[PDB]
Design a protein around this ligand. Structure first.
Ligand SMILES: [Mg+2]
Ligand SMILES: [Mg+2]
Ligand SMILES: [Mg+2]
Ligand SMILES: [Mg+2]
Ligand SMILES: [Mg+2]
Ligand SMILES: [Mg+2]
Ligand SMILES: [Mg+2]
Ligand SMILES: [Mg+2]
Ligand SMILES: [Mg+2]
Ligand SMILES: [Mg+2]
Ligand SMILES: [Mg+2]
Ligand SMILES: [Mg+2]
Ligand SMILES: [Mg+2]
Ligand SMILES: [Mg+2]
Ligand SMILES: [Mg+2]
Ligand SMILES: [Mg+2]
Lengths: 101, 77, 131, 85, 132, 194, 99, 138
RNA sequence: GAACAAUAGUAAGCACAAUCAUAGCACAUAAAAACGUUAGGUCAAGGUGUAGCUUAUGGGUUGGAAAGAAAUGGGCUACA
RNA sequence: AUGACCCACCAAUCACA
């Protein structure tokens, strides 16, 4: 079990977006170019908008890995601040410490 | 250690001209595909095989639509 | 081999035996779990990719095809004979290599069944002597 | 959902609510009472309801001077064990 | 008040480990780290992975050795191999102890795809730093 | 049945060689170490905690396998694998007069399951232009061709190679780039008269 | 700016393997597109989550095999046991509303 | 008293090839706590003096990364907790080394790397000239 | 439950204090700050007691979440 | 200048045969 249904939906999003990455890259190469004719890029536009909605990278959310928290996440540990602080305050994160200066 | 990348050498990475052999030579498709080829030239994360499959997808997609290319105002091969 | 603390250190010979034997029985339990449910240990991390830490497959890779299942289930003793019996029921010819492997399996695994397997080795195929 | 779980101490401390503000000012009645029971009290190492017998844990390491192989109990045997617990 | 990772003062009878006797502001000052790995250094990668591994290791070791675990785990990571150092009460006969040493080492070696070392230090009862 | 055995420190001889006890990197078992060592913060009347059951001594990386005697022995066993350094090369002047070319290569070690470091690809090529056979025209044309990769004060040309998966591929591509730069610096063409 | 300089630049670009013919700022984006690893392909993206099903299922099995001991699940268990003893259980599917 | 007899069997071969020369070898050890990098610098310097490798050691300036989180689970934004990560550096600079000596010293050193420290090796190696450049012109 | 030219107070412990950090002292700052108080805040970090839903108070997909009569807090830019 | 009412101390464990 992924801790939440939300976490599940995001795992599916990352799988789909990993699968169609090549298609999207290749089509958006045509789409992002001035050199090609517009008649090609319109058809290429309908082609990339044809692709499954859940395969695009902007629908992916970085969530807390343990606790599923949608924000207040430290990207380096992929952890919610809460869980992070819990772990760090027990001495379980190497090199992390309280900051005095 | 553990990864040789198919015994490939840098010229099989850097110079992709060999796969641009079938393509219209003076057209805008040469502009486009030379940009694509340069991009794949700079790419550390892909093998030779995958770059080739990119080039071939573009071959097959451009050769898929002849109609829109001819109608476009430039006759393209 | 043994743990270094004064409590777990073997006092006598019988203790050395029971301790080491216990450690091995534990390793055996673990490996049993790995091979019973391989899909859990499938996901790989290590970059050099150690082949030694992968779960093992003791199942035959093909079912109804004889020439695969024979050798497959022989490498694994009774499933090998069920395979050879499923190959002999389909009128599939067993060559000089087939029951030379099934023979090496009759010697490695296994007094009536030896005589019967020998009769099937000689009567069906005219096996080259050297096997 | 495995990382989403906790220690038994934490769970009991949570469910009993002894340290709350209701206990101090006597904001709740004495006739209401609930207790903590150890859930590790009657359990032995290696025991599960799948019924396995492990050479170092459930059963003695050596039977009749040899090494016992990993084995599993009969269905009815496990029925009697669970009845006992 | 700060409640983080604190053992509150009791009536004065409460046995406390050196570990639990020091609040988060005492890490790197008095008490050290319970994990050692490179991933949290300036130019380094995969801190996230080492963290999730760590968590699972604590949970797992706690469940595999019920009741005999004395103090929180010490996890040392050196050049792809992890040495788990543990303080363990004397509860089980050494038979069970070795059984679980082997079983665990094997199981986690096959799970995390790297060599796993397990070092058990046995202690009569929880070592008491304070009160009591 | 409860079994308590006295520690190794009892049977330990005073002069017993230490590296025999700790050959490899070890967790620090307190039973196997003879020296009384008290670590941990003290208490107002009391002392720092003993070495037995102490978790803080377990957290510490211990250099006990690396005791100076063990380093002497180890390095005396490693004297066989090492090959000598050539005499005449002792000064940097002769290093430059003989070998003009420096190839910089980075290797990284970090603890964990995977060895793969994306920074390990990069191969840097530093070559002095005074050690090259270039013509006046060829040298000026080279300087103008490479541009930023050439240092005008120290005359050190730099080629930083990235684009390929392996450091050997990048090494080959760097050397090749150098070769083609030199071959194409000597060629005079039409527009060079313009 | 000269023609000599433009020829020199075309030569440096053709040589070092960079883009040869003059391009728009807008089109260079395709060069950039294939010069990198696309976002959805990075191990920091698709490999973000640990597999929670593997951990949960594995440790569940190991619990049933009597190796791992889960106090949290034990708690849940005994609580639910007493709850169905009290007379409040979970309704068998389909029964609850209409009845 | 009890001495195993004839305990040594090393295996070394000499290939006819011209072993790679290293003008300079920089080994940069990053760490969290200072004392470990001190005992490691002592160990490394001693191991270099025993192989006669002639090394210098200096200390690159330390890097402290700080960042801020909320102290409360729900809402007080005036209150924060500040966390540090301190990376300390030792730089072992070895000069005038060969390829074999480099691989032996780097093996020995890398085996004995402590769990909490990381290491970066920059080798600047000597090559005379490439073949096609020597003194041909096209 | 104190009187120091001392009259019933001894007290371990925890806080304060001291040390530690801000790379030398010092100062400053940071950090620390018990027991309790406000049934203070948070069942929507996560976990949970009790009580509730179970072809639905659960799981999906698609598209919508507007707006300024008014009042006001904190800011930014200004009035040169 | 004013500020519903209502708020508090009357139960005993764990472990073993
Ligand atoms: Mg939930
Ligand atoms: Mg987003
Ligand atoms: Mg009094
Ligand atoms: Mg007192
Ligand atoms: Mg100070
Ligand atoms: Mg001060
Ligand atoms: Mg403060
Ligand atoms: Mg203070
Ligand atoms: Mg309230
Ligand atoms: Mg409220
Ligand atoms: Mg909830
Ligand atoms: Mg929607
Ligand atoms: Mg306003
Ligand atoms: Mg504000
Ligand atoms: Mg009135
Ligand atoms: Mg009133």
């Amino acid at each position: 079990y992924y801790v939440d249904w939300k976490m599940l939906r995001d795992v599916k999003r990352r799988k789909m977006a990993y699968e169609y990455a090549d298609e999207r890259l290749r089509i958006n190469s045509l789409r992002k170019n001035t050199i090609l004719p517009k008649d090609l890029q319109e058809v290429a536009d309908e082609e990339i908008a044809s692709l499954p909605r859940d395969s695009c990278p902007v629908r992916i959310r970085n969530r807390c890995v343990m606790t599923s928290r949608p924000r207040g996440v430290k990207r380096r540990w992929r952890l919610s601040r809460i869980v992070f602080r819990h772990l760090a305050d027990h001495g379980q994160l190497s090199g992390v410490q309280r900051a005095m200066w | 250690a553990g990864f040789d990348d198919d015994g490939s050498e840098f010229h099989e990475h850097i110079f992709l001209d060999k796969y641009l052999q079938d393509f219209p030579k003076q057209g805008p498709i040469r502009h486009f595909m030379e940009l694509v080829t340069c991009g794949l030239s700079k790419n550390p994360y892909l093998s030779v095989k995958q770059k080739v499959e990119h080039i071939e997808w573009f071959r097959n997609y451009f050769n898929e639509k002849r109609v829109i290319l001819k109608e476009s105002g430039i006759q393209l091969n | 081999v043994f743990q270094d603390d004064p409590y777990l250190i073997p006092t006598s010979s019988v203790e050395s035996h029971s301790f080491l034997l216990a450690k091995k029985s534990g390793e055996n339990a673990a490996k049993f779990i790995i091979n019973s449910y391989p899909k859990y240990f499938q996901k790989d991390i290590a970059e050099p990719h150690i082949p030694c830490l992968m779960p093992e497959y003791f199942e035959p890779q093909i079912e109804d095809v004889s020439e695969a299942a024979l050798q497959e289930r022989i490498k694994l003793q009774e499933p090998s004979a069920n395979y050879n019996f499923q190959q002999r029921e389909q009128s599939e010819e067993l060559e000089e290599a087939t029951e030379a492997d099934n023979e090496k399996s009759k010697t490695k695994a296994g007094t009536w069944r030896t005589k019967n397997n020998a009769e099937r080795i000689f009567a069906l195929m005219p096996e080259k002597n050297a096997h | 959902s495995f990382f989403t779980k906790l220690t038994a101490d934490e769970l009991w401390k949570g469910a009993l609510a002894e340290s709350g503000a209701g206990a101090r000012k006597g904001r709740g009645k004495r006739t209401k009472k609930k207790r903590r029971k150890d859930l590790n009290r009657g359990q032995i190492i290696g025991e599960g309801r799948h019924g396995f017998l492990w050479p170092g844990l459930n059963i003695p390491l050596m039977r009749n001077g040899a090494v016992q192989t990993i084995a599993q109990r009969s269905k009815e045997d496990q029925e009697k064990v669970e009845a006992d617990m | 008040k700060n409640r983080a990772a604190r053992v509150r003062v009791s009536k004065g009878d409460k046995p406390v480990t050196y570990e639990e006797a020091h609040a988060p502001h005492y890490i790197a000052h008095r008490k050290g780290w319970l994990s050692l790995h490179t991933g949290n250094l300036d130019g380094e990668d995969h801190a996230a992975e080492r963290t999730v591994e760590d968590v699972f290791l604590r949970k797992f070791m706690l469940g595999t050795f019920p009741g005999c675990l004395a103090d929180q785990l010490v996890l040392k990571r050196r050049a792809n191999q992890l040495e788990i150092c543990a303080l363990v009460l004397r509860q089980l006969p050494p038979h069970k102890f070795y059984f679980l040493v082997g079983y665990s080492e094997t199981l986690l070696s096959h799970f995390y795809k790297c060599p796993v070392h397990l070092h058990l230090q046995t202690v009569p009862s929880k070592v008491v730093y304070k009160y009591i | 049945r409860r079994k308590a055995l006295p520690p190794r420190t009892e049977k330990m001889a005073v002069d017993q060689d230490w590296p025999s006890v700790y050959p490899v990197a070890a967790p620090f078992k307190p039973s196997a170490v003879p020296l009384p060592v008290r670590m941990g913060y003290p208490v107002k009347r009391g002392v720092p905690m003993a070495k037995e059951g102490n978790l803080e001594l377990l957290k510490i990386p211990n250099f006990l396998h690396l005791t100076p005697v063990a380093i002497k022995r180890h390095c005396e066993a490693l004297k066989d694998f090492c090959t000598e350094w050539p005499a005449a090369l002792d000064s940097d002047e002769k290093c430059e007069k003989h070998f003009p070319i420096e190839i910089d290569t980075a290797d990284y070690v970090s603890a964990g399951p995977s060895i793969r470091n994306p920074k390990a690809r990069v191969v840097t090529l530093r070559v002095k232009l005074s050690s090259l056979n270039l013509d006046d025209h060829a040298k000026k044309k080279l300087i103008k061709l490479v541009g930023d990769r050439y240092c005008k004060s120290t005359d050190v040309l730099t080629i930083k190679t990235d684009r390929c998966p392996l450091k050997r591929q990048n090494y080959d591509y760097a050397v090749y780039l150098l070769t083609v730069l030199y071959h194409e610096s000597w060629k005079t063409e039409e527009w060079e008269k313009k | 700016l000269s023609e000599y300089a433009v020829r020199m630049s075309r030569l440096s670009a053709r040589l070092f393997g960079e883009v040869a013919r003059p391009t728009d700022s807008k089109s260079m984006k395709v060069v950039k597109l294939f010069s990198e690893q696309p976002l959805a392909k990075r191990k920091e993206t698709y490999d973000w989550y640990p597999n929670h099903n593997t951990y949960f299922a594995l440790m569940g099995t190991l619990r049933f095999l009597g190796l791992y001991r889960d106090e949290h699940q034990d708690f849940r268990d005994e609580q639910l046991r007493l709850k169905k003893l009290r007379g409040k259980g979970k309704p068998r599917k389909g029964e609850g509303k209409r009845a | 008293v009890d001495v195993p007899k004839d305990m040594t069997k090393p295996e070394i071969t000499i290939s006819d090839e011209p072993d790679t020369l290293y003008k300079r070898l920089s080994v940069l050890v990053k760490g969290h706590d200072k004392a470990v990098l001190d005992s490691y610098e002592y160990f490394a310097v001693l191991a270099a003096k025993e192989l006669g490798i002639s090394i210098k050691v200096h200390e690159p300036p330390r890097k402290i990364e700080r960042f801020t989180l909320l102290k409360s689970v729900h809402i007080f934004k005036k209150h924060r907790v500040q966390y540090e990560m301190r990376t300390l550096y030792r730089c072992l600079e070895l000069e005038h080394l060969t390829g074999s000596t480099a691989d032996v010293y780097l093996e020995y050193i890398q085996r004995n790397l402590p769990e909490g420290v990381a290491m970066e090796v920059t080798k600047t190696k000597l090559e005379q000239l490439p073949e096609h450049i020597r003194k041909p012109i096209w």
